Amino acid sequence: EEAPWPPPEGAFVGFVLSRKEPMWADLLALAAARGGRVHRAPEPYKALRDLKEARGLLAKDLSVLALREGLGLPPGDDPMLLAYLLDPSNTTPEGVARRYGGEWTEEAGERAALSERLFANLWGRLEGEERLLWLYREVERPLSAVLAHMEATGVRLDVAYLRALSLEVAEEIARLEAEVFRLAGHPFNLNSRDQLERVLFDELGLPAIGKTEKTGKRSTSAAVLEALREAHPIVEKILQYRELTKLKSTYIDPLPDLIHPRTGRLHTRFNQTATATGRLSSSDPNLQNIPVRTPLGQRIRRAFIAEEGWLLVALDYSQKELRVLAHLSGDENLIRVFQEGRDIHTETASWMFGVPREAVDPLMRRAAKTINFGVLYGMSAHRLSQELAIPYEEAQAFIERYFQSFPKVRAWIEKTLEEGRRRGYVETLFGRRRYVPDLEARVKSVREAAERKAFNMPVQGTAADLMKLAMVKLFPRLEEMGARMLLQVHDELVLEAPKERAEAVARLAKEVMEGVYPLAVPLEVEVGIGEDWLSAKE
DNA sequence: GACCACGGCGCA
DNA sequence: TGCGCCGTGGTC
Ligand SMILES: Nc1ncnc2c1ncn2[C@H]1CC[C@@H](COP(=O)(O)OP(=O)(O)OP(=O)(O)O)O1
Ligand SMILES: [Mg+2]
Ligand SMILES: [Mg+2]
Ligand SMILES: [Mg+2]
Ligand code: NA
Numbered sequence A: 001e002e003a004p005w006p007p008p009e010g011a012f013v014g015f016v017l018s019r020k021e022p023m024w025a026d027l028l029a030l031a032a033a034r035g036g037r038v039h040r041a042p043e044p045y046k047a048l049r050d051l052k053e054a055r056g057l058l059a060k061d062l063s064v065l066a067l068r069e070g071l072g073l074p075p076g077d078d079p080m081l082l083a084y085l086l087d088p089s090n091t092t093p094e095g096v097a098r099r100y101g102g103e104w105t106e107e108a109g110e111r112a113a114l115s116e117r118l119f120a121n122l123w124g125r126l127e128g129e130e131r132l133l134w135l136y137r138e139v140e141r142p143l144s145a146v147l148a149h150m151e152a153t154g155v156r157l158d159v160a161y162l163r164a165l166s167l168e169v170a171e172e173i174a175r176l177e178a179e180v181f182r183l184a185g186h187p188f189n190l191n192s193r194d195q196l197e198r199v200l201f202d203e204l205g206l207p208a209i210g211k212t213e214k215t216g217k218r219s220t221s222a223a224v225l226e227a228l229r230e231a232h233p234i235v236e237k238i239l240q241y242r243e244l245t246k247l248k249s250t251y252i253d254p255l256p257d258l259i260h261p262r263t264g265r266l267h268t269r270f271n272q273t274a275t276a277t278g279r280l281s282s283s284d285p286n287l288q289n290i291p292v293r294t295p296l297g298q299r300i301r302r303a304f305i306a307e308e309g310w311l312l313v314a315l316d317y318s319q320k321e322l323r324v325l326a327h328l329s330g331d332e333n334l335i336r337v338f339q340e341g342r343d344i345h346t347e348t349a350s351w352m353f354g355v356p357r358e359a360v361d362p363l364m365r366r367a368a369k370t371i372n373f374g375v376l377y378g379m380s381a382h383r384l385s386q387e388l389a390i391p392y393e394e395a396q397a398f399i400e401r402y403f404q405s406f407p408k409v410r411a412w413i414e415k416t417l418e419e420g421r422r423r424g425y426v427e428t429l430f431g432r433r434r435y436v437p438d439l440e441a442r443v444k445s446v447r448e449a450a451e452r453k454a455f456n457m458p459v460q461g462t463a464a465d466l467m468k469l470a471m472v473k474l475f476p477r478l479e480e481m482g483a484r485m486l487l488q489v490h491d492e493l494v495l496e497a498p499k500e501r502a503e504a505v506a507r508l509a510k511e512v513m514e515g516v517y518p519l520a521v522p523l524e525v526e527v528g529i530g531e532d533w534l535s536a537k538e
Numbered sequence B: 001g002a003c004c005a006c007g008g009c010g011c012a
Numbered sequence C: 001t002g003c004g005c006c007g008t009g010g011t012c
Helices: A044-050 A059-068 A079-086 A093-100 A108-125 A130-153 A159-184 A193-203 A222-226 A233-252 A320-329 A332-339 A344-352 A362-377 A381-388 A392-405 A407-423 A444-480 A502-514
Strands: A012-017 A027-034 A037-040 A269-271 A281-283 A310-317 A425-427 A433-435 A484-488 A492-498 A525-530
Touching: A012 A059, A012 A108, A027 A044, A027 A108, A037 A108, A059 A130, A079 A093, A079 A108, A079 A130, A093 A108, A130 A269, A130 A444, A130 A484, A159 A233, A193 A233, A222 A233, A310 A320, A310 A502, A320 A332, A320 A362, A320 A407, A320 A444, A332 A344, A332 A407, A344 A362, A344 A392, A362 A381, A362 A392, A362 A444, A381 A392, A392 A407, A407 A425, A407 A444, A425 A444, A433 A444, A444 A484, A444 A492, A444 A502, A492 A502, A502 A525
Parallel strands: none
Antiparallel strands: A012 A027, A027 A037, A269 A281, A310 A492, A310 A525, A425 A433, A484 A492
């Protein structure tokens, strides 16, 4: 059992933080284990210097805290990553111990011993799983070191800008609230959907379309209000009000208060075992849902800036998941569109409408996007009729016309579900698996929900695999050029480069990303450079 | 002060 | 399709 600090080489680490965010955490305890023998650090911060590598459960979090302290402690093996590859429903140390053995406690020594035991257990289970092993060695394990650097680096925020924006938005919010109260004939809490439901459907007697899932209230969702956009002018004002309060409560107000005292920057967490499909997620705060789609929303992006003397480089894969779908399905028409360098959404609109290529306006292109994404998500003709604001039968017609233009997409969905029923799981191009139960359920709604999850995963997950692999390849090149990787948003990366290097970094990053893994179609990357995230989008 | 479920909505 | 965070309403 016990033995004196320091631990031997290759030992597994255990640690306890005062809070979940490693950039903010006090390191309460540090221990290590090897051969079941546990070493406990008398003083954790000092002991941190004695480690060569962070090897154990949640290795990346310890590495981030180390980098914060000025120490170069790279994360190595982590049983969480092995478990996540075996089955992406394995998302937490608590859950992994419960499933495979042992107990996740709040004591660093026990956590270190548990890390060692779970590693041996899960490594053995991956014996012979060559494609999952490749993902571990070539994507996930090296990716964790990249993520550690991204987290510790953080991103600079224009706090003064957001403070000013806050005053501006507040004035607009107050104006709209007054108008809404005027139309309703009395004040209420406009932020309470319960109070709004009564006002709209009981007091003003507007027709109530949909109901909410768990409790069966009359919905006030944007989708419901959209269809009432003329049944009363109060609805227009409510939707405007909601857009602004969303921006204010979620981004404008909270973000400026999260600037770190040492770095003077904002630090997110990139969670590596958090999704069913192999995507990353981001939290504390989430920087993967910064507004960008509307003019009002875009203003938030201006707040994300480069260090003095640096620039942001923003790179995004064009129509990434549709290119992946083209590769997986082998559809000749999809592949041809991308091969010919044509715009997939415009080619789709030309076919979905009266054509030709040149006659496709901005409205039609936006409609084609909606149809295309619908296909990816298996969205219903009802949902599509809502989004497009067209009759139900017209949305039905569009979905059928889609599969006429891209027939092998339908065949691919069927092949994917056929094999999924047989094997109990589906997989990405590189062999990342998701176990999807209920593919043969006897209740149609349950079965069909499982089907949509199952055929989407190889697309979403292959795209995630390719992005992760691109990050692993790109990081070392950026290091050699004195540049930094800051953010990933699924199909997009944001880098930071000294001004004099930015052009060279952008050129190299584009080539690394486009060439990450050749497919039946080219991967195209759009790149922009600017002093802020909005202006960088070029 | 802290926890939660729900409806709702931001991004991919 | 996949996420994480918001305020409200409720609770301990
Ligand atoms: N309104 C929406 N609904 C569902 N998914 C959406 C979406 N908007 C985006 N996504 C998802 C799906 C795609 C991904 C990125 O959105 P891009 O805007 O970049 O769509 P892209 O295919 O590249 O078309 P392009 O940019 O040339 O107009 O996020
Ligand atoms: Mg795009
Ligand atoms: Mg984007
Ligand atoms: Mg929820
Ligand atoms: Na239901």
